[PDB]
Amino acid sequence: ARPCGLRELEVRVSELGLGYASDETVLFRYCAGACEAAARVYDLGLRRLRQRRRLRRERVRAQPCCRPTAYEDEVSFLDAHSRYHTVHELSARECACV
Amino acid sequence: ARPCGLRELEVRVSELGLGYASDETVLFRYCAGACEAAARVYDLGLRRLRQRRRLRRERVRAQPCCRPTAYEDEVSFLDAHSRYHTVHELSARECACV
Amino acid sequence: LYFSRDAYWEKLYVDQAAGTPLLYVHALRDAPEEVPSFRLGQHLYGTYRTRLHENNWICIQEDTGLLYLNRSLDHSSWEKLSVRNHGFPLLTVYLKVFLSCQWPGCARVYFSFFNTSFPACSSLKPRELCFPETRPSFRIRENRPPGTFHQFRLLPVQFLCPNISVAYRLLGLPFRCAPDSLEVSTRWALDREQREKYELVAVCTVHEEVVMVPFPVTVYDEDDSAPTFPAGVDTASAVVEFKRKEDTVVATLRVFDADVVPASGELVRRYTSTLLPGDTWAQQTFRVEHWPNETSVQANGSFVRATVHDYRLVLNRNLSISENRTMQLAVLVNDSGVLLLHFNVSVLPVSLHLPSTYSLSVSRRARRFAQIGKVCVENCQAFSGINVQYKLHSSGANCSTLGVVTSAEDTSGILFVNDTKALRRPKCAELHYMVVATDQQTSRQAQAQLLVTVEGSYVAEEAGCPLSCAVSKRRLECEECGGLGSPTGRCEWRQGDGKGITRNFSTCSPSTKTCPDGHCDVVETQDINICPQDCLRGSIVGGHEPGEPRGIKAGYGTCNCFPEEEKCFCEP
Amino acid sequence: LYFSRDAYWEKLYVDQAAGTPLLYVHALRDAPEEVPSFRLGQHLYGTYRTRLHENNWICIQEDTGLLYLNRSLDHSSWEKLSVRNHGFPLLTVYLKVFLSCQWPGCARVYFSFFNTSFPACSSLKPRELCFPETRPSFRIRENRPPGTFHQFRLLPVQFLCPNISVAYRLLGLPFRCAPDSLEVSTRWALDREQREKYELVAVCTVHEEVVMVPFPVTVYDEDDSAPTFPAGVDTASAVVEFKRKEDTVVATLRVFDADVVPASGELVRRYTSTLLPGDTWAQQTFRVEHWPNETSVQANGSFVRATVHDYRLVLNRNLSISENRTMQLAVLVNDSGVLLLHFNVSVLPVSLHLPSTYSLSVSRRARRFAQIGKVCVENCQAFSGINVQYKLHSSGANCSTLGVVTSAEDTSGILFVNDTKALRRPKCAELHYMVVATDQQTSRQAQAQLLVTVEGSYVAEEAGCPLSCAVSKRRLECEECGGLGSPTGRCEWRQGDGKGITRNFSTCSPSTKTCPDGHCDVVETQDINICPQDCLRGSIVGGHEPGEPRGIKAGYGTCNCFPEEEKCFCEP
Amino acid sequence: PVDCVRANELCAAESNCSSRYRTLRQCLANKECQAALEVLQESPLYDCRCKRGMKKELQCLQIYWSIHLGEFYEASPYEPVNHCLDAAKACNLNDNCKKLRSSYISICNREISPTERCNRRKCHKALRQFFDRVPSEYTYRMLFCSCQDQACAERRRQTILPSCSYEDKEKPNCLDLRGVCRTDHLCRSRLADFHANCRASYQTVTSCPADNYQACLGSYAGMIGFDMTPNYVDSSPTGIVVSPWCSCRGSGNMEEECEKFLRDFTENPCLRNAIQAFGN
Amino acid sequence: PVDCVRANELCAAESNCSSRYRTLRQCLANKECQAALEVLQESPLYDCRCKRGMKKELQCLQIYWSIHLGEFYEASPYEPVNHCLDAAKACNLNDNCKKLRSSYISICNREISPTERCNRRKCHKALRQFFDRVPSEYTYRMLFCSCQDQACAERRRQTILPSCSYEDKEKPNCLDLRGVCRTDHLCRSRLADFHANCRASYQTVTSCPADNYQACLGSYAGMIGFDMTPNYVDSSPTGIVVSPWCSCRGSGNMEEECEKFLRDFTENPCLRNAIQAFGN
Ligand SMILES: *[C@@H]1O[C@H](CO)[C@@H](O)[C@H](O)[C@H]1NC(C)=O
Ligand SMILES: *[C@@H]1O[C@H](CO)[C@@H](O)[C@H](O)[C@H]1NC(C)=O
Ligand SMILES: *[C@@H]1O[C@H](CO)[C@@H](O)[C@H](O)[C@H]1NC(C)=O
Ligand SMILES: *[C@@H]1O[C@H](CO)[C@@H](O)[C@H](O)[C@H]1NC(C)=O
Ligand SMILES: *[C@@H]1O[C@H](CO)[C@@H](O)[C@H](O)[C@H]1NC(C)=O
Ligand SMILES: *[C@@H]1O[C@H](CO)[C@@H](O)[C@H](O)[C@H]1NC(C)=O
Ligand SMILES: *[C@@H]1O[C@H](CO)[C@@H](O)[C@H](O)[C@H]1NC(C)=O
Ligand SMILES: *[C@@H]1O[C@H](CO)[C@@H](O)[C@H](O)[C@H]1NC(C)=O
Ligand SMILES: *[C@@H]1O[C@H](CO)[C@@H](O)[C@H](O)[C@H]1NC(C)=O
Ligand SMILES: *[C@@H]1O[C@H](CO)[C@@H](O)[C@H](O)[C@H]1NC(C)=O
Ligand SMILES: [Ca+2]
Ligand SMILES: [Ca+2]
Ligand SMILES: [Ca+2]
Ligand SMILES: [Ca+2]
Ligand SMILES: [Ca+2]
Ligand SMILES: [Ca+2]
Ligand SMILES: [Ca+2]
Ligand SMILES: [Ca+2]
């Protein structure tokens, strides 16, 4: 396994499935990996309380999912109809196991 | 559905399954709920890139799981052998949809 | 007196002997009493207005206007000059020539220096034997006594290669090339208003090559045209009835002028528009705005250009409704020959009466902020600068249910349900209101009757419904539940299409004629739960295009909105 | 002269007449020339040392020592006093009584005032007719001429109820109650060293009730005992050979004293221990430490208490090894009767030679920081205050593989593999070292031979293995892979039990005799990848109990550790 | 009543009273001292008190003990004011008592060396912080909770964590321990406060001054965190015996005074009646 | 060569040169001005230059134009220095060009009212920030990229976003637009820099001064972001025609000067050869 962090990719804008009909290429930084050495006592306690069905049958999270902390500001591009478009917060800058 | 936030519970220490043989009661504040109105453009983009199998077959997270931001400091108690125990960061103080 | 050109050209070399003529100059005159003197400047200027050394080599003949060489040259005298050029390569020097530095009072003469010596007579192509590299362009003022403005012979070429037979030739034209002397003169005086440009071809014949060179002459203008009406129209009549805004174009008329000379810098100072006095109401409510524009007119199969001055009469303040006047205004036009203009103006008052009876209904299942009908003074969409607010006056004073806001776009009032408790009571089932149409500047008003019957059954609301229609996402969860702005108690689902990011996006709205419209009127901007997809100040997640003041202008697929967080989602 | 008690007691009332006797006082004497005078204090003190008013009511007879009433009382004179009490309720006043304020030179006499009047003779229970509420406690110094110290009759009771027949009685005792006069005297002089406490019972007979009251007498001491040996022992011999630390108890002897009077405040000033001079090496290396302790000894079937002074002789600095001396020391003991003490001391030097040959081996599959054997000067675990470091000297000077750190717990050196590259070479297969045992204070040293043979095959390592043994979690992933501190190339899995949070927790360690031991020695503290579960400075997630300097002292289930993040997990 | 800090401020508003106060302070720490005393008897500094858990308590107690003229009892400078498992539950379910409880437990249970059991001064400071600024329906319910077996009495004895703050290597003399406590400023004031609300008297039917159990429990709980720290001697259910960590051995000819000092803890009827009545 | 800011600092180190400089500055903004000029001709302030994208450029240009003695051409005060889709890809894959590109696009594409298309001044400021502090292998590759059809030429025309910064409601006169630009300090300096590296000459084989294509492209790219902003007139693939947003109408008797000004953009052989050679 590999620790969670930034990974990069180069994609067309039309491959993102947002509906923009463009052909430019954007850089896409996501967070990926698996957290193993970030569990705490809260995690073990909440997991053991789920195992006894003590909870009120809701959606709780007893494994730390790896999400970004901050995001990039703006990505601008042009399309097939000569019309600029600005997308706010498309890719990540900081990956943390929160 | 109900938005994600703090929920409270009152549990015996021996019910936490940590191994402590005590009978005192502690207050347990966890985070619970479901996030619906917190998805961003990054989430839709990474989900659509998973749907085309463009990724390198790793563990990625395309739904925001609801985890605590900060935790409480210390919970101390006494057991059946007259021996105090201090547990660091057992319950949450701030729930956020990160 | 004025020079026929502005910039003269000549090539220099190394070790050119004294007494070698460089060029002629030409100064066309204005009156039959003038002899063109020619004085040189006392500085051999260099690059970018830089003095190098006092003129000590090139002398002048004032009578024929001849620039020639008094002294010789060597490499030391040009390395003396190229040091003083302040970091620039010595490529072209120039002199100033006065005549009694800008055109027409002065003309600067360039000189390109070559490091090589004078080339052989057989080493020169005929293109460099006939005409210089910079082709001339001549300037003749119209209505002036004609003279001589050009000469063909390259003087150092025939001075240093005198054995080559070189001839020059031109093609009802007013110009002529003199026989046995290669000066070029003009026969009769010119006018721009008949023709402004003369392109000719100078033909050089060597021994043997025939070379053609373009030859431009541009005729310059004086102010020889008084202004003229287009066709007899001296008056313009207009009626000020409905608009009354701060700046509205009331009347407009053209003035034709063949004169061009007062150009855009000095056109303000010369073409003078004076509104003649007599009444302070005109000068406090009207002003005379003026601007020119150039057009092209034909004279003899060509295209000359002339000016067309538009004079218009513009309001200065919001006129009141109580004005019942008519006047005639006089405008003076001065072409510094004088012109007079007339304007008939008629400011008519406005009656603001209403229909006698407004009969309309409302469902009992309706909610707060639901639009029912419009109150409007009869000439609805013709008011521009008039504030007209509407109110309500309940006669029973017990059953306050409806309310009126004044949409100033059409200047009309909107009837909306304000209180849900009084609408559900079986006692307040036939409501009688007295709608009052007011005015802000003057206290004139009108009034009308509003009978409204509250009709229907009543069905209780589900506890699993949200407070807005836009929170629902699909069709079945939209049409089976109600929101806030609905006029009948249920929400309406409009369906778009699959054409990508378009203005026709499928959504759940209270009213499909009011909510996904693109305008956030006075009802929807009260509390933001009614229609967030026309009024929000937030962010849209997905492929979108934002509203121009606010809202969602275009979205991809279905668009739902959470107004409690100021967020929308557009997604298929 | 000294008062038999310190605090006297008496009850007051309202409107008590003049000439009413309150109480007697008693002052036991010291010499047969003394007559006890009795002067009163000039202030009626109140609560918490607060002056109220000058004494103007209670007078005294100096001869018999009689406190009696000179003037009368009323409510005005006591409301005069209760104002001046500074916010306190008037409950008890007191006077001071001098005799020629603390015991024995002074005694304060309390007076409890009642707001009511004097109660009737039939309204009084006999318990309040015989003895006061605060029972007395008497103080008699030993070896003093005996006299009268107590009297029974409550003087206002028999002054105001004289018709009640009240008798008093006591049960080889030195005390006696006189016939026909209720004074209490002592027959012969006392000594504490035979008996210290006398509990008696005073018996009061009214008309009719018989009441018994405890009657304590405590005999006080003087310094009437010179110090004494326990049984004849005046010398103490001890040998300083192996310890040599800064403060070690060399010799110790008791001194018995029946005297108690120089108590713990003034025992430093009186029981004086002086180390007699003669040699500066003794006074710079030894000191005489002294402390008492009280024991209980029997005299005639009772238990008296006496002091036992322990005198011990303590080192003052780290002695060097090169000392070969012997001495006798003299200590003077002063009981301010004088005592002399002797100490035979013998400081013997230490030889620090080594065995001639150290023969040991090592596997070829081993890794860096793997413990092999110990070098140790022969008397290993007996050195206390001596620094002995060990080094290596390779004879070939090409094949540096091993290293030595000095564990100062046993003062022994540990052989550990330092370089893995030189160990895998087939050229450096028989290593010859010269181990040198040094010393810090003196440059004395020793040396020995170290032959070590590098034996085994070699198997390459898996790329899927981590750098530590503790990263593995189960048994199969522990025993099928190697770590850093292993001596054979593979890790060792130790299994605990299911007894909750215990010291026996199952883990994966390099060496099961060194890593999960509870001590972080000099090898393991070099680089923290070797044994994190004995050496970490971090946090343990799960039910645990932390190590006392550092480490994991107890854990629940299996405990693995990530030392790159300073974290451990204890979990079943 | 005006406390001694505001009394010092009102003394600072004049020149004569401040001059006599600084004069007596320079004399203490004939005809000058008696003049300064007869001026300062009418001062607001005379008969000023302090309070419990107030702002800047140590400065008020330094103002008080600098004009005391010097003795077994002293005047108190203050304003004249399974059950134990359930008490621990009621403290853990709070948010202030939980934080301060975990503070003093995590400080007092930190073993440093094999010779030093704990850090003594920070343990006493954390105990003072817990028994100053927690409301007294939580600190008394844990400390005075009636028991009927051994486990309850052991949980009740283990409350102030006696293995760190109460015990020591040796038992000193009670008079020397009293001298150590009377050298300090806070310990002397809390001891004088205990010697004002828990004395024994034969007048009242409850053996307490003015029949105030609350003042006796408040004076007892104010000593935990000092050198004269009381606790329970054993895990006996019914016998409620408190004492400091001292004994009467090595006293000399002051055995009677030392036993009379120790009987105010061991055999005090007012304090035992107060603890048993809070148990009811 | 020492720039004018350091020249002002070295002028501030003396009294006579600073006094003559302040004298000529008070005279401009007979016998006094000529004396100040004949002193300041030997000053380091004489023949000082500025640089492109330097620290405090506007102060250097204020030092320069305050000693200019006043004209069609002026001396430059500077140091004498699908392909378009791939250029956009190479700018998006960077991290500086991406941020500044998204900055000027998100500013210049913000419609305010139905009458005002965009905020003009912040659009021009964002264009200046993009074409100052991005390396010139990114700003030139997007702006001068040879095309063979209509979509490439339209993407190339849409690069500086002409609907906000280039166009207007009306086409002014080129002489009045030149007067507006010469009123400013930065626009006048960038115009004089364009009139030094992109003039036409008959001497060189490439029609450029000293055969320097790089100086002509750098002088052209320094005008984007001002009132005299050039762009392409149409989406023609081969015909590379640049001009400002002006025309020769309404000129008067200055038609020849206005057309001679406009031919330095429309029919400049040096600039067309430079753009076509960068295309090669
Ligand atoms: C001037 O006339 C031309 C004719 O086409 C027109 O395009 C232009 O907008 C006019 N300008 C003004 C200011 O009226
Ligand atoms: C305006 O004035 C004329 C003048 O007689 C009058 O006939 C007309 O009724 C007036 N307009 C109104 C609205 O009264
Ligand atoms: C037109 O303007 C000129 C210059 O101001 C003035 O002399 C002349 O009188 C004006 N014409 C009229 C009719 O006022
Ligand atoms: C004139 O009328 C317009 C249109 O309603 C209004 O916006 C403006 O404020 C008015 N101005 C004055 C000075 O009344
Ligand atoms: C609607 O009702 C509210 C509640 O009294 C009132 O404040 C508001 O002015 C009303 N709106 C109108 C347009 O009358
Ligand atoms: C004194 O002797 C007693 C006897 O049991 C012992 O408990 C105590 O520890 C001794 N104290 C010292 C200081 O030796
Ligand atoms: C110490 O001194 C004695 C005195 O003769 C000697 O016999 C003995 O060998 C000495 N010790 C050593 C280790 O040399
Ligand atoms: C014992 O101490 C006393 C007091 O200092 C002194 O007078 C006496 O001489 C001492 N005894 C001896 C033997 O020195
Ligand atoms: C004395 O020896 C001990 C034991 O090694 C050591 O810790 C201490 O530092 C030494 N002191 C001196 C002064 O050498
Ligand atoms: C182990 O080898 C390293 C590498 O040269 C060296 O720095 C270190 O001192 C060695 N350790 C010992 C105990 O010799
Ligand atoms: Ca004419
Ligand atoms: Ca004209
Ligand atoms: Ca004309
Ligand atoms: Ca709308
Ligand atoms: Ca005796
Ligand atoms: Ca003695
Ligand atoms: Ca004795
Ligand atoms: Ca170890």
Side-chain angles (χ1 to χ4, degrees), chain D residues 24-46:
Chain D
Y24 288 163
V25 301
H26 295 91
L28 295 175
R29 61 176 174 85
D30 291 329
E33 65 181 1
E34 294 175 352
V35 175
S37 178
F38 295 105
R39 293 180 291 175
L40 291 173
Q42 295 294 322
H43 293 284
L44 291 169
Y45 292 94

Side-chain angles (χ1 to χ4, degrees), chain D residues 260-393:
Chain D
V260 181
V261 182
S264 65
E266 293 181 354
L267 194 144
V268 181
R269 293 181 184 271
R270 298 294 182 184
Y271 279 97
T272 302
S273 67
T274 299
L275 182 60
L276 291 177
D279 282 324
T280 184
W281 183 68
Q283 291 181 354
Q284 287 179 354
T285 56
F286 297 108
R287 64 184 178 180
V288 178
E289 188 173 4
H290 161 69
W291 58 75
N293 198 1
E294 285 185 353
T295 60
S296 66
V297 72
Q298 294 179 356
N300 287 316
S302 64
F303 290 98
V304 299
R305 66 186 186 273
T307 60
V308 176
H309 302 281
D310 288 329
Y311 289 93
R312 58 183 61 190
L313 182 141
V314 180
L315 290 170
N316 202 4
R317 60 100 179 267
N318 286 321
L319 289 175
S320 297
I321 298 174
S322 297
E323 296 292 327
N324 190 6
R325 293 179 65 183
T326 179
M327 284 177 67
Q328 185 177 2
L329 297 176
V331 177
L332 189 67
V333 173
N334 193 359
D335 187 3
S336 179
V338 184
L339 192 64
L340 184 63
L341 306 180
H342 296 287
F343 291 102
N344 283 330
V345 67
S346 297
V347 179
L348 294 174
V350 177
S351 66
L352 67 160
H353 62 89
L354 275 76
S356 295
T357 301
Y358 288 159
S359 66
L360 47 88
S361 66
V362 59
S363 295
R364 292 186 182 176
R365 197 176 64 190
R367 298 285 300 275
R368 189 179 178 183
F369 297 108
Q371 294 185 359
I372 300 169
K374 291 183 181 180
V375 176
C376 192
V377 175
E378 182 179 1
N379 290 319
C380 287
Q381 294 179 356
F383 292 110
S384 296
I386 294 170
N387 290 317
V388 175
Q389 292 87 18
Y390 297 159
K391 292 187 287 185
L392 288 173
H393 293 285

